[PDB]
Amino acid sequence: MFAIVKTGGKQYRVEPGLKLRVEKLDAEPGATVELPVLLLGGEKTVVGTPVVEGASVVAEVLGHGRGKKILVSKFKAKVQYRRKKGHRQPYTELLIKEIRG
Amino acid sequence: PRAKTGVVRRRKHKKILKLAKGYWGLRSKSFRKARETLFAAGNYAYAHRKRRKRDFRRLWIVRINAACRQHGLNYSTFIHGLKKAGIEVDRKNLADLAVREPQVFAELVERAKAAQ
Amino acid sequence: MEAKAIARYVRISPRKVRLVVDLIRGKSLEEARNILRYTNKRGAYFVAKVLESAAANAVNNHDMLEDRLYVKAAYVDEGPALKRVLPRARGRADIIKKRTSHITVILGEKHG
Amino acid sequence: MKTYVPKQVEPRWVLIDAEGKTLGRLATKIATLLRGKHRPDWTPNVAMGDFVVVVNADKIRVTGKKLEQKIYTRYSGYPGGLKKIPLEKMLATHPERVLEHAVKGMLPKGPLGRRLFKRLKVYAGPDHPHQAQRPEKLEV
Amino acid sequence: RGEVAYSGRKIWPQKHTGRARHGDIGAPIFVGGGVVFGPKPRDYSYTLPKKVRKKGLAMAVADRAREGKLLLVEAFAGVNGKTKEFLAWAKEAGLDGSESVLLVTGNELVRRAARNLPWVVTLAPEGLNVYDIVRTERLVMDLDAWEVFQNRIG
Amino acid sequence: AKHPVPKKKTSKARRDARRSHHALTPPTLVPCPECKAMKPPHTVCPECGYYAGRKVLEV
RNA sequence: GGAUGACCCCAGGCGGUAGGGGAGCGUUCCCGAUGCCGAUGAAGGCCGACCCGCGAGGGCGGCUGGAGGUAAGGGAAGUGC
RNA sequence: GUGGAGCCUGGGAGUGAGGGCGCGAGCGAUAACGUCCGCGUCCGAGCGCGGGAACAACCGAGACCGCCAGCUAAGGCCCCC
RNA sequence: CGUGAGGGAAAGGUGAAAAGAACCCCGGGAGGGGAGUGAAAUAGAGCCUGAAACCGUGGGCUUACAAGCAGUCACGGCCCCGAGGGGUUGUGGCGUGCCUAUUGAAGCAUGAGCCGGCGACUCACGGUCGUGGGCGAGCUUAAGCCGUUGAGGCGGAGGC
Numbered sequence A: 001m002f003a004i005v006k007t008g009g010k011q012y013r014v015e016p017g018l019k020l021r022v023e024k025l026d027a028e029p030g031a032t033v034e035l036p037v038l039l040l041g042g043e044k045t046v047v048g049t050p051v052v053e054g055a056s057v058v059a060e061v062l063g064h065g066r067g068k069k070i071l072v073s074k075f076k077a078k079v080q081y082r083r084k085k086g087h088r089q090p091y092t093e094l095l096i097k098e099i100r101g
Numbered sequence B: 001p002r003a004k005t006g007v008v009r010r011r012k013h014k015k016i017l018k019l020a021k022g023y024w025g026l027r028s029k030s031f032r033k034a035r036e037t038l039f040a041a042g043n044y045a046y047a048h049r050k051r052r053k054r055d056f057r058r059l060w061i062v063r064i065n066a067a068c069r070q071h072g073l074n075y076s077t078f079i080h081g082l083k084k085a086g087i088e089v090d091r092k093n094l095a096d097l098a099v100r101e102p103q104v105f106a107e108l109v110e111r112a113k114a115a116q
Numbered sequence C: 001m002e003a004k005a006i007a008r009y010v011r012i013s014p015r016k017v018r019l020v021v022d023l024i025r026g027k028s029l030e031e032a033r034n035i036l037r038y039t040n041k042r043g044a045y046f047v048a049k050v051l052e053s054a055a056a057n058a059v060n061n062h063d064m065l066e067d068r069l070y071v072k073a074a075y076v077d078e079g080p081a082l083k084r085v086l087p088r089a090r091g092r093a094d095i096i097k098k099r100t101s102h103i104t105v106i107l108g109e110k111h112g
Numbered sequence D: 001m002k003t004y005v006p007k008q009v010e011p012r013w014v015l016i017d018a019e020g021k022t023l024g025r026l027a028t029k030i031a032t033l034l035r036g037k038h039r040p041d042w043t044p045n046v047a048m049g050d051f052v053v054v055v056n057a058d059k060i061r062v063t064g065k066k067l068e069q070k071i072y073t074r075y076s077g078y079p080g081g082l083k084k085i086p087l088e089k090m091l092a093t094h095p096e097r098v099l100e101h102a103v104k105g106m107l108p109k110g111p112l113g114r115r116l117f118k119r120l121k122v123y124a125g126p127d128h129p130h131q132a133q134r135p136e137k138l139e140v
Numbered sequence E: 001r002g003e004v005a006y007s008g009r010k011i012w013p014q015k016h017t018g019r020a021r022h023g024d025i026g027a028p029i030f031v032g033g034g035v036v037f038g039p040k041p042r043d044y045s046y047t048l049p050k051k052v053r054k055k056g057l058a059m060a061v062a063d064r065a066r067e068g069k070l071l072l073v074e075a076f077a078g079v080n081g082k083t084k085e086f087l088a089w090a091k092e093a094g095l096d097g098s099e100s101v102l103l104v105t106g107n108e109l110v111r112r113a114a115r116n117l118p119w120v121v122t123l124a125p126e127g128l129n130v131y132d133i134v135r136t137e138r139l140v141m142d143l144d145a146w147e148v149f150q151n152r153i154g
Numbered sequence F: 001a002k003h004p005v006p007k008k009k010t011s012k013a014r015r016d017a018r019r020s021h022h023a024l025t026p027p028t029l030v031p032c033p034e035c036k037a038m039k040p041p042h043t044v045c046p047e048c049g050y051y052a053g054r055k056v057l058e059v
Numbered sequence G: 001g002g003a004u005g006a007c008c009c010c011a012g013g014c015g016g017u018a019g020g021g022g023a024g025c026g027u028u029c030c031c032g033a034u035g036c037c038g039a040u041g042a043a044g045g046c047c048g049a050c051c052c053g054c055g056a057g058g059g060c061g062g063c064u065g066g067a068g069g070u071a072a073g074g075g076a077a078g079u080g081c
Numbered sequence H: 001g002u003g004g005a006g007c008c009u010g011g012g013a014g015u016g017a018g019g020g021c022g023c024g025a026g027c028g029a030u031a032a033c034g035u036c037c038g039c040g041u042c043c044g045a046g047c048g049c050g051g052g053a054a055c056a057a058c059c060g061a062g063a064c065c066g067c068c069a070g071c072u073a074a075g076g077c078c079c080c081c
Numbered sequence I: 001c002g003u004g005a006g007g008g009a010a011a012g013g014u015g016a017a018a019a020g021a022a023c024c025c026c027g028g029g030a031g032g033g034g035a036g037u038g039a040a041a042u043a044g045a046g047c048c049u050g051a052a053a054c055c056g057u058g059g060g061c062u063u064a065c066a067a068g069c070a071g072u073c074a075c076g077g078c079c080c081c082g083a084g085g086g087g088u089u090g091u092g093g094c095g096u097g098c099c100u101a102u103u104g105a106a107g108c109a110u111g112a113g114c115c116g117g118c119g120a121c122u123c124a125c126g127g128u129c130g131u132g133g134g135c136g137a138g139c140u141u142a143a144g145c146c147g148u149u150g151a152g153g154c155g156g157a158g159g160c
């Protein structure tokens, strides 16, 4: 069984036992959360229009982090314009527990 | 009191030269050419972070198109059908289904054909 | 067990000697001797001296067998240049660099 | 999740009969086959389309007065070295080159594109020497 | 560039040498040339207002008074010039050297005995000043110095 | 003429590529049949003075 | 909101040359310092894929080095190529 | 009409070589990538982004940062694409 | 250097102590290899530290059908350190150096071979406005004098 869930304005195919980084969520580490399901597949196939009324994926919050730093660098020629920015994207790491059909 | 340069410029130049590791010739060896290369590289990375989102959408769409044509419709009919059926699986996941779950993608083609 | 010798501040241009050193790198002592004897370059005299010095060091100081010796590594480094004036036409003076070489030879033993 | 990238695949050998088909509208389909964009796992940076065998290339068709008025051109690098060969003459002398040229211009430039072009095998007359590959006959 | 030792000669012609143009070698662009806007001998003093100084003096003593760190004394018992004597007096006075002390007395003999101690700063009353007060954790004056202090802040 | 001059400094890569033809070839040497010393062919042996199987030279 | 930048919530602004304003980093030196860190290793050098910081930077670790360095908070400039 | 609106006082400027395009005229030849004014615009300073094969000023659109998510603009949807 | 008046450099550091390497070995010598000294000898006198350009030896990855402001985004291969990361780059996408000057520059307009070090908005007095304090119909001293020896005070002439 696999599900396509939606969190952080993005969609991911998840199965039980998957670890996944998503956009940060207000959930204590160790809390468990329920993600909405767009489509079920594997054994049976259920198609959301757009979301499946019963379905949910249960995920355990493993913790929150900050991604590896990206250098945002800006430069315009002949105008003495330079900008240096450090960006670290917050994230939440999830452990997918079960797909509740 | 006097405040000579001392250690300050060497340290500043070494930060730049370390970022330029791997560049060709004086672009990784000379502080001046390294910094000019880094200027371009920073603008490129910013521009290509943006451009990467488009590149991957093109690839999804091309793959989605080919999976569609195995079932006798084209991409643009398939997308319209999903819109009318209310399905909102995105192109990243449609392209993954097209390759990894051909049965599921076929049922999606079914829904799209039926919606019009 | 390695043995080495260095001739430092030899008054010859590095690029010239390196040509000769490249001839013997990785060669048995005896084959390097025959090569150096019939190399028509000034550098051969100098590489031959450093080579023989390393061989003597191997036998007399480091308990290695002469029959077992090969040129394990060898390289020429550049030393301080002697700067000299070269007068040209119309009152110009150029600087000639009479370059200088540190010649290293390292011998090891070819077991069996 | 990262996008699927295929491990290397056995290519598909394919056979197309050129007789009666319009030169340009046949070429775009061959180009698509060579790029492998009919395949759901298409990847832009590896050679993974079909091998395309074409027979009866001398029987390709063309509209208007192109037989007389379409000119192929070659530059030798020498003064006056521009050669102009009309389509008629090319068909009379190296007919397989009409389709090859039409297809090559529709493939990407660069190392991968030149590689894809080698996977196209064009033959005048009804026969090809690739039985060992057992090409699958295609209707396009 | 005017005070350096070199001549005012133009080192080479303006034009047609192929080098950058130059005048004399004392110009600050040259190694060994003059300094642009270097320090010159300078008077850093200024007349702080008298009322600010006077009122400053009172506040520095008042701050010590409010912490309980101000102690007045009538006399220094057996302090006749020797460090060991001022030490013995300080012990009973509660000054064990765990806190720095500003000792303000006109008794020259008492200043001589205390002054070598690392934790003591010694002043005659006419020298009371807020830097020295704020420098030290404790303030000790005899009643005579306490009085010339009062005359000053009035 | 008008004094040609290099337009750009030659790169380390292009300098050393031009030198890809500069390595020496070892001397051609054969053993002397009389004394087994290595020496150039078609020359009188410098170690024993023999050539064509006979003494030609004090050495 | 709470009550005075404690931090949170909602909303909106945030392309930029000449140029105006604001907040910071670092360098030399002084007070702090008759202190404190230092041969169980100062400064400087060479690394690092680690930590903090938007950034200038600051830590920490290994190697080198072998005798100096200097905090919170302030002060002054021969202060950053 | 609450807007990086307006008005008053005062501190600090920079600018006083503009340029393309549209429209209205003069000059020119109902010439000029011409020239000189007016209204507007953009570039200047948005040589950042999409389209126009490429291309400051034509069309689209005002780039705080990140995303392997979605909708559109001009322009496109035979292949290169 | 200049006939001359005159111009006018560069160049500091072994170690606590010379204990400055007897003697042997290759070499004509230079230089080195051992021995030995030293806490340390890439502190060995061409000596503290010992950056960078620049030169070389060894190793990993890579390269002889390929179009390039040299990077960047992606994926894959190999090597390395142990659902991760570092090195390398085959292919695919995108992509007109920096500075200056200009209406406008990748520009075939200026400057720069590369590296390291030196290198340009200050100071005094007066002015004007803002600002942190002191005192307020008042505010403030100057030169000096006394004290101190990194102690402050006195001094009202005068100024606003």
Ligand SMILES: NC(=[NH2+])NCCC[C@H](N)C(=O)O
Pocket (backbone or CB within 6 Å): E111, E115, E122, E123, E124, I149
């Ligand atoms: N009574 C004194 N002023 N004592 C000061 C202590 C020592 C001071 N440096 C001096 O020269 O006197």
Ligand SMILES: [Mg+2]
Pocket (backbone or CB within 6 Å): A006, A007, A008, A009
């Ligand atoms: Mg969400």
Ligand SMILES: [Mg+2]
Pocket (backbone or CB within 6 Å): A016, A017, A018
């Ligand atoms: Mg799993």
Ligand SMILES: [Mg+2]
Pocket (backbone or CB within 6 Å): A021, A022, A023, A089, A091, H067
């Ligand atoms: Mg993320």
Ligand SMILES: [Mg+2]
Pocket (backbone or CB within 6 Å): A073, A084, B038, B042
């Ligand atoms: Mg940068």
Ligand SMILES: [Mg+2]
Pocket (backbone or CB within 6 Å): A077, A078, I098
């Ligand atoms: Mg530029």
Ligand SMILES: [Mg+2]
Pocket (backbone or CB within 6 Å): A077
């Ligand atoms: Mg540019």
Ligand SMILES: [Mg+2]
Pocket (backbone or CB within 6 Å): A077, A078, A079, A080, A081
């Ligand atoms: Mg600039």
Ligand SMILES: [Mg+2]
Pocket (backbone or CB within 6 Å): A078
């Ligand atoms: Mg400009």
Ligand SMILES: [Mg+2]
Pocket (backbone or CB within 6 Å): A075, A076, A077, A078, A079, A080, A081, A082
């Ligand atoms: Mg710039």
Ligand SMILES: [Mg+2]
Pocket (backbone or CB within 6 Å): none
């Ligand atoms: Mg100093």
Ligand SMILES: [Mg+2]
Pocket (backbone or CB within 6 Å): B004, B005
């Ligand atoms: Mg400086």
Ligand SMILES: [Mg+2]
Pocket (backbone or CB within 6 Å): B004, B005, B006, B007
């Ligand atoms: Mg310095």
Ligand SMILES: [Mg+2]
Pocket (backbone or CB within 6 Å): B005, B006, B007, B008, B009, B010, B011
């Ligand atoms: Mg420096």
Ligand SMILES: [Mg+2]
Pocket (backbone or CB within 6 Å): B008, B009, B012, B013
């Ligand atoms: Mg710098």
Ligand SMILES: [Mg+2]
Pocket (backbone or CB within 6 Å): B007, B010, B011, B014
């Ligand atoms: Mg450094």
